[PDB]
Amino acid sequence: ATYDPNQPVTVESFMPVEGKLREKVIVKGSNFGTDKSKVKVYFVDEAAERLSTVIGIDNNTLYCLAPRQLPGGNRIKVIVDGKEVTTDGTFKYEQAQNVSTISGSASKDGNDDGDLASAKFKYMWGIAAVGNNTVLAYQRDDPRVRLISVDDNKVTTVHPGFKGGKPAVTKDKQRVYSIGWEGTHTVYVYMKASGWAPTRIGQLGSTFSGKIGAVALDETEEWLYFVDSNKNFGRFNVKTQEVTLIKQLELSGSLGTNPGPYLIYYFVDSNFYMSDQNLSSVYKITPDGECEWFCGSATQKTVQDGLREEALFAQPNGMTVDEDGNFYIVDGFKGYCLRKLDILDGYVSTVAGQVDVASQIDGTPLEATFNYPYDICYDGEGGYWIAEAWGKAIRKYAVE
Numbered sequence: 001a002t003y004d005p006n007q008p009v010t011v012e013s014f015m016p017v018e019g020k021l022r023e024k025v026i027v028k029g030s031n032f033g034t035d036k037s038k039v040k041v042y043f044v045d046e047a048a049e050r051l052s053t054v055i056g057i058d059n060n061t062l063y064c065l066a067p068r069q070l071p072g073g074n075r076i077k078v079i080v081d082g083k084e085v086t087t088d089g090t091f092k093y094e095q096a097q098n099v100s101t102i103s104g105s106a107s108k109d110g111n112d113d114g115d116l117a118s119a120k121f122k123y124m125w126g127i128a129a130v131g132n133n134t135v136l137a138y139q140r141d142d143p144r145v146r147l148i149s150v151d152d153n154k155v156t157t158v159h160p161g162f163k164g165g166k167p168a169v170t171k172d173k174q175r176v177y178s179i180g181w182e183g184t185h186t187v188y189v190y191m192k193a194s195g196w197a198p199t200r201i202g203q204l205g206s207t208f209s210g211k212i213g214a215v216a217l218d219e220t221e222e223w224l225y226f227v228d229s230n231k232n233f234g235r236f237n238v239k240t241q242e243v244t245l246i247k248q249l250e251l252s253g254s255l256g257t258n259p260g261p262y263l264i265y266y267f268v269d270s271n272f273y274m275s276d277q278n279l280s281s282v283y284k285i286t287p288d289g290e291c292e293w294f295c296g297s298a299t300q301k302t303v304q305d306g307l308r309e310e311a312l313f314a315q316p317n318g319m320t321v322d323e324d325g326n327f328y329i330v331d332g333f334k335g336y337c338l339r340k341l342d343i344l345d346g347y348v349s350t351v352a353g354q355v356d357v358a359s360q361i362d363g364t365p366l367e368a369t370f371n372y373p374y375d376i377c378y379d380g381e382g383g384y385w386i387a388e389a390w391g392k393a394i395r396k397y398a399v400e
Helices: none
Strands: 010-015 024-030 039-044 049-058 061-065 072-080 083-086 091-093 097-104 124-129 134-139 144-149 154-160 175-179 186-191 198-203 223-227 232-237 243-248 262-266 271-276 281-285 291-296 316-321 327-331 337-342 347-353 373-378 383-388 393-399
Touching: 010 072, 024 072, 039 061, 097 347, 124 316, 124 383, 134 383, 154 186, 175 223, 223 262, 262 316, 271 316, 281 316, 327 373, 337 373
Parallel strands: 124 373, 316 373
Antiparallel strands: 010 024, 024 061, 039 049, 039 072, 049 061, 072 083, 072 091, 097 393, 124 134, 134 144, 144 154, 175 186, 186 198, 223 232, 232 243, 262 271, 271 281, 281 291, 316 327, 327 337, 337 347, 373 383, 383 393
16 A cells, blocks of 8 residues: 555566566565655666666556666666665566668768758768767768758758867767867867857867867866877867867877877766777876876787777777766778777677678678778767768667
């Protein structure tokens, strides 16, 4: 009937014993009460407790929807008013994965807007996932910023002429920031409230003499961080316009300029991580500009999976991170595949594409192929959006 504070919460059973994303799961027990706000249900895998949407409740029953979670047998955890129970049994989750082409083709070269099938692109090298199956994509050739909305079946251009690489997306996805590749490095913001139209918010100055291929927001999202191709690591304040050269990185050799090193912010340690084509490696950079090797070899450009410390890239390009702190790196020339660093395993695996096969096959990820995948951005909900260079296309790797 009614919740009793003096009694424990119990779970006796659940159903079904296996399922896929958004499976309707019923958990049977006692003392759940009748207030969903005081309940949390988790499907618990090896990496995390995955919060589940509870759709109905009574004192003996929870109706919830299976969330994205790791494949295999996962226990269910019920919390009611602090009281925690984890099941003896496991719910066997069946995960789905797919690579699909969103718009564009290597067989299409152009700037044509239109619908998803009618649009054309040129070489792209940056992408922002802004949720709701929508991305902003950045062309190198006939440089521009394209807006692709899958649910609206619509490709438009929001910023003709602008040449930028990897953008930064705010947590709330209401803003995307870009810095111009060359010149004075003009800083733009694209706002949802403007329909993703650009607003100029400043410039770095040609003091940052290198090309700029990426920008990353700090934890507070007050600062944009970047490393130019001449190793100038710096930041720019998006409210006050303050610009600071933090350090010229102590790295040997020449960084790339096509578009330049890719940089991301990593929430797990609040450091930045940088990839470069020429060094064919990823480096950890602290906010003060201290650099350390993280993955790959500057002398061995080849796809090799294994522990982080032995893994190799052919051409590590853009990167993104999932909610578990795993890294994703698109691997370009001689690779054409998606590399995942699973941080719990400390292990680099190739999860999509076929090594050194440049094409655009869709389907199950290990049968799928990519054509110079160059940047990637995670949407927070299992979607990995990929901008291709010579592929001239947007692809989506979806994990459900």
